[PDB]
Amino acid sequence: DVFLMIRRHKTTIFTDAKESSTVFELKRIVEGILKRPPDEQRLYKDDQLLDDGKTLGECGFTSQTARPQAPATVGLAFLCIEPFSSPPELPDVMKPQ
Amino acid sequence: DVFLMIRRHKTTIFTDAKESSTVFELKRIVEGILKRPPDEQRLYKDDQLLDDGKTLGECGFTSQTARPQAPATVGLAFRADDTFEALCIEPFSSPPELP
Amino acid sequence: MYVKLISSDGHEFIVKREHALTSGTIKAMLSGPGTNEVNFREIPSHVLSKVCMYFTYKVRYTNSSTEIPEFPIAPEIALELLMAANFLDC
Amino acid sequence: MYVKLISSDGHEFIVKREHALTSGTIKAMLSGPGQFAENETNEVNFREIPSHVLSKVCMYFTYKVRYTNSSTEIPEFPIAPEIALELLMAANFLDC
Amino acid sequence: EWIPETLYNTAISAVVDNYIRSRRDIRSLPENIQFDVYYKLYQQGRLCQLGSEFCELEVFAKVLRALDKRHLLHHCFQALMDHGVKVASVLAYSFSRRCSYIAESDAAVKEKAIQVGFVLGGFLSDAGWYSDAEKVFLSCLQLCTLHDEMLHWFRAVECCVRLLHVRNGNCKYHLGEETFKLAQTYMDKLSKHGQQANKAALYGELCALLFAKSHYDEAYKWCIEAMKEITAGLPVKVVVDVLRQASKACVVKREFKKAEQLIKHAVYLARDHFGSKHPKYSDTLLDYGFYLLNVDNICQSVAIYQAALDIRQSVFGGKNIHVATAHEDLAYSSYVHQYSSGKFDNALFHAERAIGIITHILPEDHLLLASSKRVKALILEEIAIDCHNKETEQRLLQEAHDLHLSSLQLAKKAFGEFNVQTAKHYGNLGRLYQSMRKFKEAEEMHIKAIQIKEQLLGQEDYEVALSVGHLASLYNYDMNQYENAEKLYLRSIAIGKKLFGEGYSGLEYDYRGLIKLYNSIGNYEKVFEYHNVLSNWNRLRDRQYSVTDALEDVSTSPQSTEEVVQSFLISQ
Amino acid sequence: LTRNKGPAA
Ligand SMILES: [Zn+2]
């Protein structure tokens, strides 16, 4: 099964998406919570537009790269995706001070 | 025997001589390296008097106080423009924080 | 049915209610006062993202009959996430 | 004779050549195009070794040559515990 | 003379004595000084200051890089594992986590992790901790399968061949077949792209797996295919492993002249490259001791095993599975050699240590216990009959009964009913029942042993001969079935003459059995005939069995590589 | 010494 992380300028969306589900399926799922009908908003994968009717298999969301442990990240345009403010860097132990 | 760590500014000559030996042969040993006459130089044993005569027995260090492990420091100064410059030895380096 | 969690840095994390109800104090977030807002100021955004990924990991793999794989808690985000796991009682 | 050792901070450490030939690295540095005997005093130059550890290195050179195959009980070399590590790192580089 | 210590050794003792304060800056030292600090910590006995440092995988990675002092690292590591800290499990678990984390990284980081895993798994499987070596090799294999690049195929083959060696030493034979199937799938799709990897190591591990499972004929076939794939570019470790496994496979197929030169070349290669105090050299001496213990060479097999044990007692000593294997193999060899005299104080001691080490580091239902619990049992009954107290007699007989029954159950669960090892267990039970005065089912045990041995090893084989000799000794001495004992004794002496000639050790036993057989039926001329034959046999044993230490019989610079293998191949 | 030796180990 496929799990992915739909996000935008801010916010993130956690959803379950099937292999045979379309991008428009995810558009309706986002509309059910975030409104913004699918004509207004476009789902973006790493600077690549996703067709409204294409199956999620061709979009690159294989089950290996979309497991719930590390769900795939896709952008939402109405990009401006804000990072997660990475944790403080840990020392490399063997680095000689 | 008595081992010495004769130093001056940056120079840190290492020498050895018997405890019964005198200062003059130490000055000759130093002369054997920098080619400076004994009268041109003057030894400042921890910045005090140290005559050209005497001997290492009463100079201030003994074989049990000048071991090869930690030789006792002895200063040195030459003659510059009809005057003898003061002892201007500086420490080796600052060790870092202990851990 | 979808509830959003905002971190200390302002990042908002929507998630299904049954996914967020497997936590300890997120149930206390939802219960009591009555889309719902849950605010954190001691929880940075990366650890909250890892917690939400853990919610998705738990609900999907609950009572699974196969060899369940470990949840990848990265070594750098491990101490902050550990305290989040205690604070969220997850 | 009386090879001169220079630390990274410019501290000359003139010591007997037979004293300083007990370390393999200094022996190698003197050999080759190294016996530059124009000044009659060889001028090995360590741009990595600090002076506070080169002092103990020369002290160990005197310790090693003086106490070689000695019949008496050989006292332990008194390495300070602050520069014990740094001396250690100058112990295999110099192969002394 | 009293030479002073070098400044290096004096500085080590000045850093170790200040270890707890400068433990951070030591990890930044050169990789050839870090080992010396840690080895000094081991020498001073500060194992907890050391075990606190070897548990991290990154610190142990630089320690493993010092291949010069691996013979000291093995001793240090083995001293940690019996100290109480489980360094083997911790390192394997840490490496498994780090592999599962960086599985998504680029090819360079994955390749570096695979190399670290190869060196760490080679060390752990070399130290004997096989159960904690799968978790490293499995993680390396998992890293291999992600990307379909060519070097990934070849390193998956390497993961499979090294992992197969771990499982055979761990006695997980049921997974060895699956590992070989995976390896041959990878090598088939490697050869599909136009390049062939070297098949010697994998087929040698198959030889070891099938010989351990007692599939002697297929082990011979696979060692043939292994030695058909030996070239000069192979590492000497792989080469000597293939030759020693093929030497073991040749003996069970009763082709000793080939096994002679094979084991001689293996011991020569192990001594020439590795040294006289290397664990691989100890393994080659274990296989040499097995070979000598098979073909009549018993007064020197113990000396070979004692040398084999003393290497493993020094390179990595204490409670380790390799030291336990050396003790178990020596104890059976000492049991055989010392059998004539009747004393068994030393052999029982070396059997008990092998029992007391395997039961500490392996589960109580592990196959390596079964291969050891027999030996002690085979000693106990021999101590039991030579004793005089009847209560002690009965107690040691029942203890041997318990050990044999546990070993039989483990072997039956592992291999199956129809195998050589289960037949050996049946023969041991039969001779024990003969020793326990229960002769009714002793015949049943012996016939069950022979009908399985002769079905797999043929009507003429060493194990078959030994089992029918036990059955004949049961018949003629105690069950009074004198008519049936004659044909079995003739079969035993015939197989002894065919395989080992007239110098076989059991020929004395079967000749004395025949003497007692003919004394009962009053045929005194046959008594005289076999008495003359027994005297001739004793003279023969006193003639061609001279003092020849087998550590020297391997000589120096014999037929080198590409010559012994070629002669063995063309000798088929 | 009634019997022969053990089969193997
Ligand atoms: Zn400890």
Side-chain angles (χ1 to χ4, degrees), chain A residues 67 91-97, chain E residues 24-25 27-28 34 58-59 62:
Chain A
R67 68 194 93 87
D92 211 354
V93 177
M94 316 308 188
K95 188 92 183 73
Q97 306 289 45
Chain E
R24 158 60 196 136
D25 198 19
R27 292 185 221 121
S28 68
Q34 273 185 221
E58 279 179 311
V59 182
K62 291 192 290 184

PDB file of all heavy atoms in Angstrom, chain A residues 67 91-97, chain E residues 24-25 27-28 34 58-59 62:
ATOM      1  N   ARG A  67       6.280   3.788   2.057  1.00  0.00           N
ATOM      2  CA  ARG A  67       5.874   3.085   3.261  1.00  0.00           C
ATOM      3  C   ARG A  67       5.517   4.088   4.359  1.00  0.00           C
ATOM      4  O   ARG A  67       6.004   5.222   4.354  1.00  0.00           O
ATOM      5  CB  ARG A  67       6.988   2.151   3.732  1.00  0.00           C
ATOM      6  CG  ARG A  67       8.233   2.853   4.243  1.00  0.00           C
ATOM      7  CD  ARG A  67       9.393   1.880   4.364  1.00  0.00           C
ATOM      8  NE  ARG A  67      10.220   1.857   3.164  1.00  0.00           N
ATOM      9  CZ  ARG A  67      11.232   2.683   2.935  1.00  0.00           C
ATOM     10  NH1 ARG A  67      11.569   3.621   3.805  1.00  0.00           N
ATOM     11  NH2 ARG A  67      11.920   2.566   1.803  1.00  0.00           N
ATOM     12  N   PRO A  91      27.939  15.309  16.807  1.00  0.00           N
ATOM     13  CA  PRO A  91      29.358  15.128  16.486  1.00  0.00           C
ATOM     14  C   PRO A  91      29.628  13.758  15.885  1.00  0.00           C
ATOM     15  O   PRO A  91      28.915  12.786  16.143  1.00  0.00           O
ATOM     16  CB  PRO A  91      30.054  15.290  17.842  1.00  0.00           C
ATOM     17  CG  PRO A  91      28.996  14.996  18.851  1.00  0.00           C
ATOM     18  CD  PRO A  91      27.716  15.490  18.251  1.00  0.00           C
ATOM     19  N   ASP A  92      30.681  13.692  15.074  1.00  0.00           N
ATOM     20  CA  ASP A  92      31.030  12.485  14.336  1.00  0.00           C
ATOM     21  C   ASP A  92      31.963  11.563  15.112  1.00  0.00           C
ATOM     22  O   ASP A  92      32.563  10.667  14.508  1.00  0.00           O
ATOM     23  CB  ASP A  92      31.668  12.858  12.995  1.00  0.00           C
ATOM     24  CG  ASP A  92      31.377  11.842  11.908  1.00  0.00           C
ATOM     25  OD1 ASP A  92      30.782  10.790  12.218  1.00  0.00           O
ATOM     26  OD2 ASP A  92      31.747  12.097  10.742  1.00  0.00           O
ATOM     27  N   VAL A  93      32.113  11.782  16.421  1.00  0.00           N
ATOM     28  CA  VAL A  93      32.938  10.967  17.313  1.00  0.00           C
ATOM     29  C   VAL A  93      34.398  11.009  16.877  1.00  0.00           C
ATOM     30  O   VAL A  93      35.249  11.572  17.572  1.00  0.00           O
ATOM     31  CB  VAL A  93      32.432   9.513  17.390  1.00  0.00           C
ATOM     32  CG1 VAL A  93      33.351   8.679  18.260  1.00  0.00           C
ATOM     33  CG2 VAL A  93      31.029   9.475  17.924  1.00  0.00           C
ATOM     34  N   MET A  94      34.697  10.419  15.719  1.00  0.00           N
ATOM     35  CA  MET A  94      36.070  10.342  15.240  1.00  0.00           C
ATOM     36  C   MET A  94      36.595  11.667  14.706  1.00  0.00           C
ATOM     37  O   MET A  94      37.787  11.753  14.393  1.00  0.00           O
ATOM     38  CB  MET A  94      36.181   9.263  14.167  1.00  0.00           C
ATOM     39  CG  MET A  94      35.450   8.009  14.559  1.00  0.00           C
ATOM     40  SD  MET A  94      36.000   7.520  16.198  1.00  0.00           S
ATOM     41  CE  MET A  94      35.220   5.926  16.344  1.00  0.00           C
ATOM     42  N   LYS A  95      35.753  12.684  14.593  1.00  0.00           N
ATOM     43  CA  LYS A  95      36.230  13.994  14.170  1.00  0.00           C
ATOM     44  C   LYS A  95      37.134  14.565  15.254  1.00  0.00           C
ATOM     45  O   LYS A  95      36.687  14.737  16.395  1.00  0.00           O
ATOM     46  CB  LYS A  95      35.057  14.929  13.898  1.00  0.00           C
ATOM     47  CG  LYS A  95      35.460  16.251  13.270  1.00  0.00           C
ATOM     48  CD  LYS A  95      35.406  16.170  11.752  1.00  0.00           C
ATOM     49  CE  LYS A  95      35.871  17.467  11.111  1.00  0.00           C
ATOM     50  NZ  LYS A  95      37.346  17.639  11.222  1.00  0.00           N
ATOM     51  N   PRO A  96      38.394  14.868  14.953  1.00  0.00           N
ATOM     52  CA  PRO A  96      39.371  15.282  15.985  1.00  0.00           C
ATOM     53  C   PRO A  96      39.180  16.724  16.440  1.00  0.00           C
ATOM     54  O   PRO A  96      40.022  17.601  16.213  1.00  0.00           O
ATOM     55  CB  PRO A  96      40.708  15.063  15.271  1.00  0.00           C
ATOM     56  CG  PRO A  96      40.386  15.299  13.840  1.00  0.00           C
ATOM     57  CD  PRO A  96      39.019  14.732  13.627  1.00  0.00           C
ATOM     58  N   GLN A  97      38.050  16.968  17.102  1.00  0.00           N
ATOM     59  CA  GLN A  97      37.704  18.275  17.661  1.00  0.00           C
ATOM     60  C   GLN A  97      37.737  19.390  16.617  1.00  0.00           C
ATOM     61  O   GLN A  97      38.671  20.193  16.583  1.00  0.00           O
ATOM     62  CB  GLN A  97      38.638  18.622  18.829  1.00  0.00           C
ATOM     63  CG  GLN A  97      38.718  17.570  19.945  1.00  0.00           C
ATOM     64  CD  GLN A  97      37.461  17.471  20.808  1.00  0.00           C
ATOM     65  OE1 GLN A  97      36.335  17.454  20.311  1.00  0.00           O
ATOM     66  NE2 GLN A  97      37.662  17.406  22.119  1.00  0.00           N
TER      67      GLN A  97
ATOM     68  N   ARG E  24      37.805  10.827  25.326  1.00  0.00           N
ATOM     69  CA  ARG E  24      37.282  11.456  24.119  1.00  0.00           C
ATOM     70  C   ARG E  24      38.380  11.641  23.078  1.00  0.00           C
ATOM     71  O   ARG E  24      38.188  11.329  21.897  1.00  0.00           O
ATOM     72  CB  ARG E  24      36.632  12.796  24.482  1.00  0.00           C
ATOM     73  CG  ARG E  24      36.500  13.814  23.350  1.00  0.00           C
ATOM     74  CD  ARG E  24      35.666  13.301  22.186  1.00  0.00           C
ATOM     75  NE  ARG E  24      35.853  14.118  20.994  1.00  0.00           N
ATOM     76  CZ  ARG E  24      36.027  13.628  19.775  1.00  0.00           C
ATOM     77  NH1 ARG E  24      36.071  12.325  19.556  1.00  0.00           N
ATOM     78  NH2 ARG E  24      36.173  14.466  18.753  1.00  0.00           N
ATOM     79  N   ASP E  25      39.544  12.132  23.499  1.00  0.00           N
ATOM     80  CA  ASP E  25      40.597  12.474  22.552  1.00  0.00           C
ATOM     81  C   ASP E  25      41.349  11.250  22.043  1.00  0.00           C
ATOM     82  O   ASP E  25      42.053  11.349  21.034  1.00  0.00           O
ATOM     83  CB  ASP E  25      41.571  13.462  23.198  1.00  0.00           C
ATOM     84  CG  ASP E  25      42.419  14.196  22.179  1.00  0.00           C
ATOM     85  OD1 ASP E  25      42.032  14.228  20.992  1.00  0.00           O
ATOM     86  OD2 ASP E  25      43.472  14.744  22.566  1.00  0.00           O
ATOM     87  N   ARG E  27      39.907   8.589  20.795  1.00  0.00           N
ATOM     88  CA  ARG E  27      39.227   8.155  19.581  1.00  0.00           C
ATOM     89  C   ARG E  27      39.654   8.936  18.344  1.00  0.00           C
ATOM     90  O   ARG E  27      39.305   8.533  17.230  1.00  0.00           O
ATOM     91  CB  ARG E  27      37.713   8.260  19.763  1.00  0.00           C
ATOM     92  CG  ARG E  27      37.150   7.266  20.760  1.00  0.00           C
ATOM     93  CD  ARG E  27      35.637   7.326  20.801  1.00  0.00           C
ATOM     94  NE  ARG E  27      35.133   7.234  22.165  1.00  0.00           N
ATOM     95  CZ  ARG E  27      34.388   8.162  22.750  1.00  0.00           C
ATOM     96  NH1 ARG E  27      34.045   9.272  22.118  1.00  0.00           N
ATOM     97  NH2 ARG E  27      33.978   7.970  24.001  1.00  0.00           N
ATOM     98  N   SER E  28      40.380  10.037  18.508  1.00  0.00           N
ATOM     99  CA  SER E  28      40.927  10.784  17.385  1.00  0.00           C
ATOM    100  C   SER E  28      42.356  10.383  17.043  1.00  0.00           C
ATOM    101  O   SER E  28      42.955  10.989  16.152  1.00  0.00           O
ATOM    102  CB  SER E  28      40.874  12.287  17.678  1.00  0.00           C
ATOM    103  OG  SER E  28      41.765  12.631  18.724  1.00  0.00           O
ATOM    104  N   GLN E  34      45.404   3.608  18.527  1.00  0.00           N
ATOM    105  CA  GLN E  34      44.163   3.331  19.241  1.00  0.00           C
ATOM    106  C   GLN E  34      44.100   1.881  19.691  1.00  0.00           C
ATOM    107  O   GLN E  34      43.636   1.589  20.799  1.00  0.00           O
ATOM    108  CB  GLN E  34      42.962   3.664  18.360  1.00  0.00           C
ATOM    109  CG  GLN E  34      42.531   5.105  18.447  1.00  0.00           C
ATOM    110  CD  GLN E  34      41.266   5.369  17.672  1.00  0.00           C
ATOM    111  OE1 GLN E  34      41.140   6.393  17.005  1.00  0.00           O
ATOM    112  NE2 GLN E  34      40.315   4.448  17.758  1.00  0.00           N
ATOM    113  N   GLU E  58      31.510   2.161  15.656  1.00  0.00           N
ATOM    114  CA  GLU E  58      32.483   3.040  15.016  1.00  0.00           C
ATOM    115  C   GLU E  58      33.865   2.887  15.636  1.00  0.00           C
ATOM    116  O   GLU E  58      34.876   2.921  14.925  1.00  0.00           O
ATOM    117  CB  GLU E  58      32.013   4.491  15.095  1.00  0.00           C
ATOM    118  CG  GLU E  58      30.992   4.869  14.037  1.00  0.00           C
ATOM    119  CD  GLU E  58      30.530   6.306  14.161  1.00  0.00           C
ATOM    120  OE1 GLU E  58      30.163   6.720  15.281  1.00  0.00           O
ATOM    121  OE2 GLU E  58      30.540   7.026  13.141  1.00  0.00           O
ATOM    122  N   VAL E  59      33.933   2.729  16.960  1.00  0.00           N
ATOM    123  CA  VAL E  59      35.222   2.532  17.612  1.00  0.00           C
ATOM    124  C   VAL E  59      35.801   1.174  17.245  1.00  0.00           C
ATOM    125  O   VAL E  59      37.011   1.036  17.029  1.00  0.00           O
ATOM    126  CB  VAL E  59      35.080   2.692  19.136  1.00  0.00           C
ATOM    127  CG1 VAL E  59      36.427   2.525  19.813  1.00  0.00           C
ATOM    128  CG2 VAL E  59      34.465   4.037  19.470  1.00  0.00           C
ATOM    129  N   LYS E  62      37.679   0.969  13.602  1.00  0.00           N
ATOM    130  CA  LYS E  62      39.083   1.335  13.466  1.00  0.00           C
ATOM    131  C   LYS E  62      39.991   0.318  14.140  1.00  0.00           C
ATOM    132  O   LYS E  62      41.147   0.153  13.733  1.00  0.00           O
ATOM    133  CB  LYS E  62      39.321   2.725  14.046  1.00  0.00           C
ATOM    134  CG  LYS E  62      38.682   3.833  13.241  1.00  0.00           C
ATOM    135  CD  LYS E  62      39.199   5.180  13.689  1.00  0.00           C
ATOM    136  CE  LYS E  62      38.685   5.513  15.072  1.00  0.00           C
ATOM    137  NZ  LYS E  62      39.090   6.877  15.511  1.00  0.00           N
TER     138      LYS E  62
END
